Amino acid sequence: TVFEELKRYVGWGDGDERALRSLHGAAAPHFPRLAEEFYDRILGHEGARTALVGGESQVGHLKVTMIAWLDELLGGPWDEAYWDRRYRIGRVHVRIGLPQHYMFGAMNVHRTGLARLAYERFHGDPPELERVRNALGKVLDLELAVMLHTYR
Amino acid sequence: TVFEELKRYVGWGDGDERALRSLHGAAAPHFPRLAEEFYDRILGHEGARTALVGGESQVGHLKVTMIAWLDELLGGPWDEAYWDRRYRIGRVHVRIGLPQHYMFGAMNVHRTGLARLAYERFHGDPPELERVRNALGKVLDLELAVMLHTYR
Ligand code: HEM
Ligand code: HEM
Ligand SMILES: [C-]#N
Ligand SMILES: [C-]#N
Ligand SMILES: [Cl-]
């Protein structure tokens, strides 16, 4: 019952779902750049770069799937079907033997870029920036929770 | 070496340490409120609440160590001794049999309250808010990384 238990813990509601869909509007034009920053960080890092051995075409294909990951992250819905898909995504990284600690590093790159886009779009309406900032934190902490469940 | 590999991944530097120290002075007066918010979430959650059956003194003592936990989070330093203390804290929770996913729910409560406090203090200086918000996301993500290393 992991996503169900944590939605309750963090106070997930319709309000968070609206806020993320508002953020999708602002962020989606920038998904290619966020994917770019994400693989740049992996390819810049001595330990993490050893996970990516398929070459020039592999990063191109992973950028395509990361763009779709982002699009689902912000657009939803965030029902059982969505979270079961996130479980399988966790298991993929488990099966390639990626060390779990890299998942927190990688999610931090998305967290930082997405927090920046949110500020840039919503700073003029502080109460909507707060709703959007709060939802973003929740969805990213639940993604980490679900992906790290698969490592157990 | 979770802390050291991951610190390079997220770009942890002297500037993150300065941003968090700057927030400390603003946020410290609110640590009692944050601690209250943290415990009220545990007590309102059907699964998590059963870990607090040691009475009003158990909750009172946990509040004290949580205010110390927050003071260290934002005050530092973030050295080998710090991160060793964080491993030990992680192990406490493994030892008492707390489901690992609750660590993500609980951390989200602090992330939400601390992100509001950073905005409140730094929103008249958007480049400083940027540094503080980035440092806060990093430190919480590293904390989760170390905590969940202990659950392996
Ligand atoms: C926020 C963190 C991450 C997310 C959201 C993420 C997401 C994804 C997604 C959606 C897929 C496609 C799975 C499928 O085919 O359906 C995937 C595959 C993959 N990811 Fe990640 N990933 C993350 C972290 C990492 C990291 C840190 C690395 C390496 C440093 C990595 C390397 C890979 C590789 C190599 C594959 C392909 C595996 C294979 O097909 O053999 N990922 N990831
Ligand atoms: C961000 C998440 C959390 C942090 C930072 C945190 C921090 C701490 C700290 C610093 C201690 C003190 C260890 C010591 O006395 O040396 C502790 C103990 C404890 N925590 Fe947490 N904690 C978290 C999540 C949780 C959750 C979700 C629960 C329960 C639902 C919980 C229940 C406890 C209990 C029962 C103890 C005391 C165990 C004993 O009697 O020895 N904590 N925590
Ligand atoms: C992972 N791409
Ligand atoms: C745990 N307090
Ligand atoms: Cl903000």
UniProtKB/Swiss-Prot annotation, chains A, B:
The protein's role, per its UniProt record: Member of the two-component regulatory system GcHK/Anae109_2439. Autophosphorylates in response to oxygen availability, and then transfers the phosphate group to a conserved Asp residue in the receiver domains of the cognate response regulator Anae109_2439, resulting in its activation.
Per UniProt, O2 binds at 39
- For this entry, the protein name equals Globin-coupled histidine kinase
Read off the domain note: Consists of two domains: an N-terminal heme-based oxygen-sensor domain, and a C-terminal catalytic domain that exhibits histidine kinase activity. The coordination and oxidation state of the sensor domain heme iron profoundly affect the enzyme's catalytic activity.
Binding-site residues, heme: 93
How is the subunit organization of this protein annotated in UniProt? Homodimer.
Map out region (Globin sensor) in residue numbers: 1-149
Disulfide bonds, which pairs? none
Post-translationally, this protein is described as follows, namely: Autophosphorylated.
Record annotation: effect of changing residue 39 to L:
80-fold increase in O(2) dissociation rate constant. No effect on O(2) association rate constant
Portion of the full sequence shown: 7 to 158 of 382
Domain of life assignment: Bacteria
